[PDB]
Nucleic acid binder design. Structure first.
Length: 205
DNA sequence: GGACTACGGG
DNA sequence: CCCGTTAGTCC
């Protein structure tokens, strides 16, 4: 598998990478490529500046409030929900508005199809999805990693990743995005897995 | 009880 | 890199 290859590739870089992979164990990153783009994008938007626990509670309230079935709400279902009802699920007002925008775009077929997104390079995904209000570099990276299942995404702009890179690379302060990109270059073409390993560091304590 | 913990807005 | 937001956890 690519995970097995990624684990061996990372371990091959140097002793610290080898040790990190051994401490954390096999990669268990589980993306959900079965999700429609509007769903993956809404999930990523919700996660901005929020813990996974908070994001989870919000999406769960969202499903119960807007779905006929407690499944992920459809674009039509989202459109039929007023902003304040969305807001009481725990989205910020601004995210609530952006989620309506995503739904309307999906409903109007203004989002690229799932089929075309699955053919796009990271660069094309960035160009295509960043037009959506509330969706910029980080959100697209998270969509690419946790929905699409892309293997070579380095979300070097992610604050948590920078903090773990600080620890792993033995830095005395928080690295800039561009510094993280340089430091993780040898991890190509499995930078998503590299990022996942760094992200597991707090669980080692 | 809290401190603070990507993105658009003004 | 002016300013404020959503929630839950664990400092």
């Amino acid at each position: 598998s690519d995970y097995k290859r990624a684990e061996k590739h990372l371990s091959s870089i140097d002793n610290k990478w080898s040790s990190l992979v051994k401490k954390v164990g096999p990669c268990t990153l589980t993306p959900h490529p079965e999700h429609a783009p509007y769903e993956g994008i809404i999930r990523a938007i919700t996660s901005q500046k929020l813990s996974d626990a908070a994001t989870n509670s919000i999406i769960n309230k969202f499903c119960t409030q807007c779905s006929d079935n407690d499944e992920f709400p459809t674009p039509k279902q989202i459109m039929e929900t007023d902003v304040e009802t969305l807001h009481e699920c725990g989205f910020s007002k601004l995210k609530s508005q952006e989620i309506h925008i995503v739904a309307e775009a999906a409903l109007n077929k203004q989002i690229p199809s799932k089929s075309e997104i699955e053919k796009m390079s990271e660069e094309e995904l960035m160009e295509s999805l960043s037009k959506i209000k509330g969706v910029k570099r980080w959100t697209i990276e998270m969509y690419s990693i946790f929905t699409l299942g892309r293997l070579d995404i380095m979300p070097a702009d992610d604050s948590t990743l920078k903090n773990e890179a600080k620890e792993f690379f033995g830095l005395s302060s928080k690295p800039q995005t561009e510094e993280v990109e340089k430091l993780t270059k040898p991890c190509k073409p499995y930078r998503t897995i590299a990022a996942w390993y760094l992200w597991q560091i707090p669980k080692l304590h």
